[PDB]
């Protein structure tokens, strides 16, 4: 029964029914359907007197996520809706429309919404002749302060995605996420029952409270979120199933707040291995910006006092926002229609950007004299390639252009570099601060080359700019004592 229709404090009630002929294999578990049938009765010989087992004989199914598989892994798309999808694909502002159509009740978070769009689209799966394959899913983690609608974002993603499973961090076991070996009560034989993430095959799993993964349960997903396969060797059963799922995880940095005063590795208990599989890692922070606070408060007040149900409907009718169902069908059509591949110029740009990013990580680790908790590796380049493919796919472009490369680089810098750019000798910094305070006059300025000749990375100048005692104005060629 529908969870929204259960009685208060009551577990959902199951009910058996039978399909027939052309109605067989019409739907799959986890799908929401409506049935018109006959409420029939049969007497099972398996504990009162004159009791009778009730059931339904089916005479009609009305689903919304198509037949078995994803419309049987082929297009069940009528000509009118297909042509509508093509027309939507030709919209130049389609990117902005999709971004605005992601969590309308959630104010701001534009980059997060764009990353969600990329995830829902996903890259193009590659299968090489030599045998090994290249996955086309995007793994995104959302860290940050509590109360930033991350759980709301995961719930919306689960709502909008054609295939989506929403799970809680604490209420999650490794045997319940991928596969459970269970003994058949009648035949006394063991068999495998698909786990939560398996039910999300070809879709997405939204794991809230990602920080509440049991360490023995979190590791069990390492193989399947990367190899897209699950290997089970239990109770005489040795199988390797496929799980081509997207992963959207919501976690919390230690201490509740991020606590940027501590080291970035201290705030994140997740090891480098699990962080390596994840493609995008957003870190949201509560700016406590009073004007931003006012804007969010106004948006939330409009949300509560019935104004949301009017403005969202009006804006959706305006055409800059679109309903959940139409986005679901459009995403399905785009994923089943296009598998874009990169252009050689895009490949050169991506290689250059990857080398730049690795050099940046190397210099950051050298300055910190410590391995960065954020790993940047070849898998990150694969993530960028997949995001470029998703950007080309949502436009139904058969080949990815450098516009997609630029946007993917921007999103990567906005999320993964933002995570990797977080910072917690001091004697040199203090000496430089004091010498420039005593030398550089309070109301005057001097060129940066003067400081270079006087004499490193010279993060002291950036720290003082944070303190608003110095300011770089002439394109970094002139440092002026701002008045402090």
């Amino acid at each position: 029964e529908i969870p929204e229709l259960v009685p208060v404090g009551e577990m959902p009630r199951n009910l058996t029914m039978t399909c027939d002929r052309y109605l067989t294999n019409k739907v799959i578990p986890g799908t929401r359907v409506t049935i018109v049938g006959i409420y029939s009765i049969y007497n099972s010989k398996n504990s009162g007197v004159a009791i009778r087992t009730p059931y339904i004989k089916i005479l009609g199914i009305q689903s919304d996520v198509e037949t078995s598989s994803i419309w049987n892994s082929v297009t069940m798309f009528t000509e009118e809706e297909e042509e509508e999808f093509l027309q939507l694909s030709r919209n130049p502002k389609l990117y902005e429309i999709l971004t605005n159509s992601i969590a309308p009740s959630i104010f701001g978070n534009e980059d997060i919404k764009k990353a969600i769009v990329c995830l829902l689209m996903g890259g193009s799966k590659k299968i090489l002749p030599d045998g090994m394959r290249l996955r086309g899913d995007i793994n995104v983690l959302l860290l940050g302060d509590p109360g930033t609608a991350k759980s709301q974002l995961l719930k919306f993603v689960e709502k909008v995605s054609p295939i989506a499973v929403y799970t809680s961090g604490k209420g999650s076991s490794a045997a319940g996420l991928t596969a459970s070996v269970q003994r058949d009560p009648m035949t006394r034989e063991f068999y495998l029952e698909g786990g939560a993430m398996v039910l999300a095959d070809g879709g997405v799993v939204c794991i809230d409270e990602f920080d509440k993964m049991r360490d023995e349960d979190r590791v069990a997903i390492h193989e399947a979120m990367e190899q897209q396969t699950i290997s089970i060797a239990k109770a005489g059963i040795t199988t390797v199933l496929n799980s081509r799922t997207s992963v959207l995880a919501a976690a919390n940095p230690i201490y509740g707040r991020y606590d940027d005063l501590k080291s970035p590795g201290d705030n994140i208990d997740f090891q480098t291995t699990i962080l390596s599989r994840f493609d995008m890692i957003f870190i949201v922070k509560d700016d406590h910006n009073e004007e931003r606070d006012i804007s969010i408060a106004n948006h939330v007040i409009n949300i509560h006092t019935g104004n949301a149900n009017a403005m969202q409907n009006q804006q959706e009718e305006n055409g800059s926002e679109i309903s959940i169902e139409k986005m679901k069908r459009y995403i399905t059509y785009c994923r089943l229609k296009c598998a874009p591949r990169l252009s050689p110029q895009a490949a050169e740009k991506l290689s250059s950007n990857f080398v730049t990013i690795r050099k940046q990580l190397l210099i950051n680790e050298l300055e910190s004299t410590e391995r960065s908790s954020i790993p940047i590796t070849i898998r990150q380049l694969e993530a960028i390639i997949r995001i470029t493919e998703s950007l080309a796919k949502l436009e139904l472009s058969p080949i990815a252009q450098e516009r997609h490369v630029d946007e993917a680089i921007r999103l990567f810098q906005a999320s993964t570099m933002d995570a990797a750019s977080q910072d917690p000798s001091l004697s040199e910094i203090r000496r430089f601060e004091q010498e420039l305070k005593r030398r550089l006059p309070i109301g005057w300025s001097t060129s940066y080359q003067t400081l270079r000749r006087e004499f490193a990375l010279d993060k002291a100048l950036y720290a003082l700019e944070k303190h608003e005692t110095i300011q770089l104005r002439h394109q970094g060629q002139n440092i002026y004592r701002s008045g402090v």
């Binding site: 302060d145 509590p146 109360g147 930033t148 609608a149 509740g256 707040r257 509560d286 406590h288 009073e290 606070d293 006012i294 969010i296 408060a297 106004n298 939330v300 007040i301 409009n302 509560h304 006092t305 019935g306």
Partner: protein, 96 residues
């Protein structure tokens, strides 16, 4: 049997109160003031309208909720800055 509505209200005062709450929380404060806390004001106002069997949240139901929220926040702060915080917040609990 009561489902009060927040049609009669002034979003300006609530927005300013939430902004000031966040401003004083980030600056010399440890109480987390998030959007959930802003929703708490409307929830308490709804409860106030419920206990009067009112189907619409009156102005008193909003001012009482705002005063309760700001007092609970202030009492959660150290006494050293508690007097200054109360002095700042006194302009919002007018009438009671």
């Amino acid at each position: 049997k009561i489902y009060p509505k927040l049609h009669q209200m002034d979003m300006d005062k609530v927005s300013r109160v939430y902004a000031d709450l966040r401003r004083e929380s980030i600056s010399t404060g440890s109480f987390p003031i998030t959007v959930r806390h802003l929703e708490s004001i409307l929830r308490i106002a709804e409860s106030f309208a419920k206990m009067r069997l009112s189907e619409f949240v009156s102005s008193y139901d909003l001012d009482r909720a705002i005063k309760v929220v700001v007092d609970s926040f202030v009492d959660a702060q150290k006494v050293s800055v508690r007097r200054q915080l109360r002095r700042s917040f006194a302009i919002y609990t007018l009438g009671h």
